[PDB]
Design a protein around this nucleic acid. Structure first.
Lengths: 60, 143, 62, 262, 206
RNA sequence: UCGCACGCGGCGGCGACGACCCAUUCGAACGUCUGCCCUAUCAACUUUCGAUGGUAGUCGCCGUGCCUACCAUGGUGACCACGGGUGACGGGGAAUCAGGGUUCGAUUCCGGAGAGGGAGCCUGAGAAACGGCUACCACAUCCAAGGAAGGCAGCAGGCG
RNA sequence: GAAACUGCGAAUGGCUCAUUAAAUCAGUUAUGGUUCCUUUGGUCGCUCGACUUGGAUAACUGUGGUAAUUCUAGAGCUAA
């Protein structure tokens, strides 16, 4: 599950893949433009209010 | 006499409810030397398709024919006879075209066999495109 | 659509009878004495005379 | 079709342009303007085919955009401009001025007019229009919407407008005996005095025109254009002067011209 | 879609035409507007020539006219009572051209009480508490009173027109076509025109 | 709004573009009178599922049963109506004739219809456009089997 | 000066004659029963309250997906 992370206050963006499902319950079953805290995605990700914007399917 | 429908029929141009202390009937000339009938001016018929008390303009061709049917209301059927020349056999053939012509009720005494004079205008209906301009009396018929 | 003539026209008319002795005598006189090549141009001068004769005849009727 | 036409076949071109059919399949389609397609003559035809300055269509393209052609007071850079009747095409380079006048035949005649003649032209009005504030209007043959005209100008009179100011100078009353110019039909190109007016309500009125040589003829009023009062014209006249003397003596004049000079 | 074509139907003699082309764009027909009573909801639609037509769907007010006094005013429409074309346009209250509708009388009643300043409507027993029209009835200038007194020569009104002023509901006929221009203008029934539908409305009730 | 010279607190010359409206050009669209191959082993046809007219409206750029609601029973025909076939796109025209006629006109100009068969639509002033979309039908294509994508009766060219 | 936004054209032309028998079409007239691109000629300080307003976005940087489309998704921007 690739994650295209973008941080608008600096303008940088990179692709990072995540390989566990228990961290993805805070991303699954949610709609567009929601302010989501990324406190469970990793040790470096805490207090990170991330807005989800949607990407591409496995068929593109 | 009049006003036997659901709506109120009246002449649209005139106003008949001005402050007071007969009707100012609307009528117009038609042109081409045609004299407007006396009954249109003094009568109480009102009809939007009349060539004198209605909003129809006479243009184009002017034809004539003989009336054959009058069972239809406010419109009649006339007959026109003509001969078509065939170039092979130096003869002719009797051909007739029976179009539908609107009859304004200004012309009161119109009989089957009268030689009617019609005038082209805008299409009044699916087939009607001609309106009666004058009614010449049939040959003889003094009784 | 192209801009050209499309006008093909014969310059001669073949006789109605092909094999009569009288016509074969007359055109053979005209070929050898004046050095012609074939019966086609024999008919080709006759077709030009037919136009002039027909154009004159309609003027006499006028 | 599904819209307006944009091409024009060479076969479908009008006969008075006299364009040859062996050159191209197409014809120069005239652009829209103050004149109709059929009776106008495009600027490309007047230069390449009438005056023979230009050879090809690209050669016409360059000359018109050198800003050397001034049609009736305004420079137009379109090769297919609808130059109609008596458009004063003024050429500045050679000091030469052309006014499109009909010949004795149906063709436009190549008539050179004097520079002092180039300042005015005669326009036939069509209707007297009342503007939105009681403003009289006149609409000419080239669609010149002239507001505040002379009140005595009627439906079918002609006005001698002035080109540099866009305003009228005089006008000619439509009356019998005045000179005329037959603009259309079999009598196209005829000049003669008006002798009889026939009224036809509903139909088209026909006016009999007496020629200068006494060859009286008829023409409907829609193809009739007066040019002056009595026997005095208001413009210059080309050779032939619109007589249409019958073809028996163009045979005589053409034969006599060759044998006289030798 | 629904189209306006003459070649799809029979001849004059009764023969059946056979089509030689499919439906054209200039034969286009559109669904009806069928505007009702409500706040202004008008939809604009593009038509042939790049023009605009105003498809009204809910209308409340209209610039009806009272032609005897040469005055017109904007008043709110309340009810629809009669339509000559169909009876289902009365039950389903739909506004088209030539509809007999009901309107409030106060925009026209005040004009009688201002320009003429005489009691119309106003069933006897009650007097105006805002007192504005009472001020307008009196307190005229001496030189304009003679001109005011000549306004009473034509200050008479027909009883049938005065009768509907009593309840405040005036019968009026639609004159403008509503689904095209979007407006609902018209005029008030008067005299011979007014008494004709009163016979028909009574015949509707029975 | 943008570009060239610019001469005197601000005004001037040469333009392009832009729009509201009116005429003009240009189309498109309905009508008006006349004209069309054969067929009677096609003589009655049309209609309350509009057939022909009247009234009032809807819709339409507008005239109009175009459509709706209420009415009248009307309209065409032996002068061939209606219907069927057409190996029928129509005309200007072509061949052929002394005179008259016969046959042809898919074909360069004009006008109509279409893009495999229907149907519906977006934009645009103008399309029911298909070298534009939206679906069904028939044919056909790549596929990783998840999906995507096509219309040469346009010039060539290939099969039948 | 590539690109891209914008404007216009793309409804012209070309092919074919399947459908179609007062239908198309041909001659003649009408739109006073209508709509109009473009062009041309006219209008457009007339109305009684600024030395030029506003924020999006394409191109571009960069993250990418789908086997694949003239497929596009996200993040910073920047003009009419």
């Amino acid at each position: 599950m690739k994650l295209n992370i973008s941080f608008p206050a600096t303008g940088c963006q990179k692709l990072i893949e995540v390989d566990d499902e228990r961290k993805l319950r805070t991303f699954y079953e949610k709609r567009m433009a929601t302010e989501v805290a990324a406190d469970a995605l990793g040790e470096e990700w805490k207090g990170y209010v991330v807005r989800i914007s949607g990407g591409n399917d496995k068929q593109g | 006499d009049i006003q036997t429908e659901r709506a109120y029929q009246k002449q649209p141009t005139i106003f008949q409810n001005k402050k007071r202390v007969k009707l100012p009937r609307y009528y117009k000339n038609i042109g081409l030397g045609f004299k407007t009938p006396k009954e249109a001016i003094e009568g109480t018929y009102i009809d939007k398709k009349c060539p004198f008390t209605g909003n129809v303009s006479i243009r184009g061709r002017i034809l004539s024919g003989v009336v054959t049917k009058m069972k239809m209301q406010r419109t009649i059927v006339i007959r026109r006879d003509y001969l078509h020349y065939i170039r092979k056999y130096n003869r002719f053939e009797k051909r007739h075209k029976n179009m539908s012509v609107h009859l304004s009720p200004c012309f009161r005494d119109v009989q089957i066999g009268d030689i009617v004079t019609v005038g082209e205008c805008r299409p009044l209906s699916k087939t009607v495109r001609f309106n009666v301009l004058k009614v010449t009396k049939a040959a003889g018929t003094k009784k | 659509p192209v801009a050209r003539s499309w006008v093909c026209r014969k310059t001669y008319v073949t006789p109605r009878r092909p094999f009569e002795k009288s016509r074969l005598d007359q055109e053979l006189k005209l070929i050898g004495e004046y050095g012609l090549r074939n019966k086609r141009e024999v008919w080709r001068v006759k077709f030009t005379l037919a136009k002039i004769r027909k154009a004159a005849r309609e003027l006499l009727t006028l | 079709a599904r819209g307006p036409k944009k091409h024009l076949k060479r076969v479908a071109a009008p006969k008075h342009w006299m364009l040859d059919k062996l050159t191209g399949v197409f014809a120069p389609r005239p652009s829209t303007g103050p004149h109709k397609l059929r009776e106008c003559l495009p600027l490309i035809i007047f230069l390449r085919n009438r005056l023979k300055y230009a050879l090809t269509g690209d050669e016409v393209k360059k000359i018109c955009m050198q800003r050397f052609i001034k049609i009736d007071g305004k420079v137009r850079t379109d090769i297919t401009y609808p130059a109609g009747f008596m458009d004063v095409i003024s050429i500045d380079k050679t000091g030469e001025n052309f006014r499109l006048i009909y010949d004795t035949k149906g063709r436009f005649a190549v008539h050179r007019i004097t520079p002092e003649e180039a300042k005015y032209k005669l326009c036939k009005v069509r209707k007297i229009f009342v503007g939105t504030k009681g403003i009289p209007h006149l609409v000419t043959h080239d669609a010149r919407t002239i507001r505040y005209p002379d009140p005595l100008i009627k439906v079918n009179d002609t006005i001698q407008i002035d080109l540099e100011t866009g305003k009228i100078t005089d006008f000619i009353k439509f009356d019998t005996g005045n000179l005329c110019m037959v603009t259309g039909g079999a009598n196209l190109g005829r000049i003669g005095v008006i002798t009889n007016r026939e009224r036809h309500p509903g139909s088209f009125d026909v006016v009999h025109v007496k020629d200068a040589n006494g060859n009286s003829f008829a023409t409907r009023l829609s193809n009739i254009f007066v040019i002056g009062k009595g026997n005095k014209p208001w413009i210059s006249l080309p050779r032939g002067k619109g007589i249409r003397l019958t073809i028996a003596e163009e045979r005589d004049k053409r034969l006599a011209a060759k044998q006289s000079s030798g | 879609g629904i189209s306006r074509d003459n070649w799809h139907k029979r001849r004059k003699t009764g023969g059946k035409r056979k089509p030689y082309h499919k439906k054209r764009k200039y034969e286009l027909g559109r669904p009806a507007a069928n505007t009702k009573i409500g706040p202004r909801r008008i939809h604009t639609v593009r038509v042939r020539g790049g023009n605009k037509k105003y498809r009204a769907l809910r209308l409340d007010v209209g610039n009806f006219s009272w032609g005897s006094e040469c005055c017109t005013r904007k008043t709110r429409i309340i009810d629809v009572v009669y339509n000559a074309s169909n009876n289902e346009l009365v039950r389903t209250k739909t506004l088209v051209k030539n509809c007999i509708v009901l309107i409030d009388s106060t925009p026209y009643r005040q004009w009688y009480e201002s320009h003429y300043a005489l009691p119309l409507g106003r069933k006897k027993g009650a007097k105006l508490t805002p007192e504005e029209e009472e001020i307008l009835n009196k307190k005229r200038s001496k030189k304009i009173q003679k001109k005011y007194d000549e306004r009473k020569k034509n200050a008479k009104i027909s009883s049938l027109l005065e009768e509907q002023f009593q309840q405040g509901k005036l019968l009026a006929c639609i004159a403008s076509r509503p689904g095209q221009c979007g407006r609902a203008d018209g005029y008030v029934l008067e005299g011979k025109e007014l008494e004709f539908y009163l016979r028909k409305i009574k015949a509707r009730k029975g």
